[PDB]
Each structure stands twice: as C-alpha cells, then as structure tokens.
Design a protein around this ligand. Structure first.
Ligand code: CYC
Ligand code: CYC
Ligand code: CYC
Lengths: 172, 162
C-alpha cells in the first residue's frame, strides 16, 4: 500500500534519484492542506450509513428491476449483500482519501471486482450508478460550509470525486 | 510500504471498519511532524554529493585496507570506489525517503530487507557502512527537530547493521 508520500518515494527510488524540488513542494503542500483532508475523511466516515442508505434508495427508485423478484437485489440476503458492497467501496474510498493515493482502493477493493460481479450476474453498471450516487452525497457532506472554518476545498473534492469515479469505472 | 498513514489504514482494514478518531489523530501528528522532517530531507538532498564524497573518505581513512586489498569487495580499484560511493548514496537517499514518508518504511523495504544476506554474500563489512553513517550524522549540519528526525533514521540504519 502507498500513500501520496510513499508513491513519490517509490517513483524516485525506481530511478535511483533524490526528490526534486517540485516533488518536495507538492508533498509539502499536501501537508499544509492536511486539515481539510482530515475533515473530508471524518465527515464522510461519520455519515457513511446515511450516504449508503440514501444512495441505495435512489438506485432502486431509478432501477426498479433490481428489486423485482428475480432481480439481483431481490431477497433480503441479496439486498444486504448489495448494501454491504456499497459500504465496502465507500470504506476503501475513505482510505484512499486519507492516503492521498488510490493504491489501497485499487489493490484491495477494485482489482478483480468486475470479474466478480460478472461471475455472479450482478450488473456492474448498476453498481457504478450506486457508487456515483454515493459520490455526490459524500461530496455534498464533505464540502458543506456549515460548522467548518471557511476555506477552499475544491482541489480535494476533485481528488475525492476521482476516487469514486475510478471505482465506478472499475465495474462499469 | 509502512508509513504512519498506511499503518492506520491497515489497522482499520484488518478489522473491516472505517478509520477511528485515534487513527485520524495519528495522521494529524504525522502532518505536524512532517514540517521539520521534510526540512531535513531537502537539506540532505541539497548537500548530498558533499556528504557522499566526504562519507566515502571517512570510511577509507577509518579502514585503510579497503584502499589496497585486492578483491572485488574492496575499493581497491576505481570500480570498487564507484560501488562504494554508489552504496553510500543509496543509504543517504533512503534517509531522505524516510524523512519524506514519516517513517522507516522506505529503508525497511528497499535496503534493510535482505541487508545481512547481501553484506555476507558479497563480503561487505557493515562497519564500513556504519562509519559512513556516523560521518553523515556529524556533518549534515542540521539542528533542532530537523536534526532529531534525521538522526533517528540514521541511528535506525546503524542499528540494522549491528
Ligand atoms: C473542505 C473539507 C471544507 C473546509 C475545511 C477546513 N478545515 C479547516 C481547519 C481545520 N480542520 C480541522 C480538523 C481536524 N484536525 C484533526 O486533527 C482531525 C482528526 C481528529 C480533524 C478532523 C482542524 C483541527 C482545523 C484547524 C482548526 C479549525 O477548525 O479552524 C480549514 C482552515 C484551514 C486549515 O487548513 O487549517 C478549512 C478550510 N472549510 C470549508 O469551508 C470546506 C467546506
Ligand atoms: C449493490 C449496489 C448491487 C448488488 C450487489 C451484490 N453483491 C453480491 C455478492 C458479492 N459482492 C462482493 C464484493 C466484495 N467482497 C469483498 O470482500 C470486497 C472487497 C475486498 C468486495 C468489493 C463479493 C466478493 C460477493 C460474493 C461473495 C459474498 O457474497 O460475500 C451480491 C450477492 C450475489 C448472490 O447472488 O448471492 C449482491 C446482490 N446487486 C445488485 O443488484 C446492486 C446493483
Ligand atoms: C563502501 C562503504 C565500501 C565498498 C563498497 C562495495 N559494494 C559492492 C557491491 C554491492 N553493494 C551492494 C549494496 C546495495 N545494493 C542495493 O540494492 C542496496 C539498497 C538500495 C544496497 C545497500 C550490493 C547488493 C552489492 C552486490 C551487487 C552489486 O555489485 O551491485 C562492491 C563490489 C562487490 C563485488 O564483489 O563486486 C563494493 C566494492 N567496498 C569497500 O571496500 C568500501 C569501504
């Protein structure tokens, strides 16, 4: 697993090189902006059950065939597996946010996930939609100006969006 | 790779759970420490060649036989001196990487794993590399906690050679 710092170190080590000033500057900026990253992780983590439930309700309002009998989310066992999958993906995304690198999400969650759903008959495009709904909810929560010190989190929200988008693309 | 941030993630993942408040506080602490630690890494990087060159001489002055004993494993020859300067550069680079990442992981993974086997197989004396390390610790010219963070990873390397 890599965080943003280890990624830069690994890239540098493969070339046998000390860090450049551009790399130092990028990592120092990540540190200086660190409080915002911690808030995003904290806020999304603290609201995770809400993000999952509302994204699931939205998914099934939009794709009612999933909850018709015979649909992939019909029976409480399959519905519970689906909700669990949404929470798993969200959990690994919060790890990527803390790390500032997608490696943990790629290696421990996304790798092989498309094939897993194909083998099950779970439609990956529906999982991608669930993920995108969680994205929008997580970012509205993480970027909410209420009860937080005013400042610009837009670069971080784009980074967060990219992790969600990368997860959706992995199953789409 | 072990860092304070990946350690926190790994603990949460091991238990299938979201990150705890105590894990976020651990990353905050890493961010607070990163300031001086990255200061040291830039300083060492900017003066690396002087430190490498000076460290090479420190070793030869402490162990003059490495100057003249015939053998691959000696700085006997110009290629031996190249290999030795290279290795010293490797150790310094690893210290910069630990300072950048906030812990020992880069040196654990890229240098310490297998170190004893490499030094044994290739007839390389650990004392050689310890002397190089002591010279870097005394001549990097850092102070305050930048020197604290740096000398921690230096001592850590000396210990792995002991
Ligand atoms: C974007 C995410 C929104 C935003 C973020 C923002 N936060 C701060 C300042 C702080 N954030 C924290 C949070 C933590 N510190 C920790 O150690 C932990 C783990 C337990 C957390 C969650 C803290 C302590 C601060 C400093 C004190 C404070 O509340 O001001 C800022 C200010 C700038 C900075 O980086 O310090 C900002 C901008 N603000 C917004 O408007 C976004 C919606
Ligand atoms: C929910 C939006 C959609 C859905 C989900 C669904 N998933 C499964 C079964 C499994 N899901 C996984 C995924 C993971 N397990 C892990 O450990 C990890 C990370 C390491 C992931 C990403 C796996 C492995 C399975 C099979 C094994 C298991 O169930 O534990 C199901 C059940 C399939 C069945 O027929 O029993 C379902 C329903 N279905 C939908 O319709 C949503 C689009
Ligand atoms: C300098 C203190 C003394 C010295 C140096 C010397 N080293 C070698 C050969 C090797 N050095 C290493 C060290 C590393 N390889 C790595 O990947 C890492 C971590 C990034 C380290 C620390 C290794 C593995 C070798 C063997 C493989 C190689 O040749 O690269 C030599 C040559 C040994 C030989 O028999 O050809 C020398 C001379 N010798 C002295 O006398 C200096 C005091």
């Amino acid at each position: 697993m890599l965080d943003a710092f280890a990624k830069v170190v690994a890239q540098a080590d493969a070339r046998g090189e000390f860090l450049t000033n551009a790399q130092f500057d990028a990592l120092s900026n990540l540190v200086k902006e660190g409080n915002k990253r911690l808030d995003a992780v904290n806020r999304i983590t603290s609201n995770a059950s809400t993000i999952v439930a509302n994204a699931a309700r939205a998914l099934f309002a939009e794709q009612p065939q999933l909850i018709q009998p015979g649909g992939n989310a019909y029976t409480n066992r399959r519905m519970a597996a689906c909700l669990r999958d949404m929470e798993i993906i969200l959990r690994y995304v919060t790890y990527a946010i803390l790390a500032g690198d997608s490696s943990v999400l790629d290696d421990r969650c996304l790798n092989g996930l498309r094939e897993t759903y194909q083998a099950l008959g779970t439609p990956g495009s529906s999982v991608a939609v669930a993920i995108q709904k969680m994205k929008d909810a997580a970012i509205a929560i993480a970027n909410d100006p209420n009860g937080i010190t005013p400042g610009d989190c837009s670069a971080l929200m784009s980074e967060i969006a990219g992790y969600f988008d990368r997860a959706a693309a992995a199953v789409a | 790779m072990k860092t304070p941030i990946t350690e926190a993630i790994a603990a949460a993942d091991t238990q299938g759970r979201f990150l705890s408040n105590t894990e976020l506080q651990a990353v905050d602490g890493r961010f607070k420490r990163a300031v001086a630690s990255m200061e040291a890494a830039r300083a060492l990087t900017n003066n690396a060649q002087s430190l490498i060159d000076g460290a090479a001489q420190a070793v030869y002055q402490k162990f003059p036989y490495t100057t003249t004993m015939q053998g691959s494993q000696y700085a006997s020859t110009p290629e031996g001196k190249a290999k030795c300067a290279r290795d010293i550069g490797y150790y310094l680079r690893m210290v910069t990487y630990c300072l950048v990442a906030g812990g020992t992981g880069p040196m654990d993974e890229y240098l310490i794993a297998g170190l004893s086997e490499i030094n044994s197989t290739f007839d390389l004396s650990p004392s050689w590399y310890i002397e190089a390390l002591k010279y870097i610790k005394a001549n990097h010219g850092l102070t305050g906690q930048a020197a604290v963070e740096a000398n921690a990873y230096i001592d850590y390397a000396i210990n792995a050679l002991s």
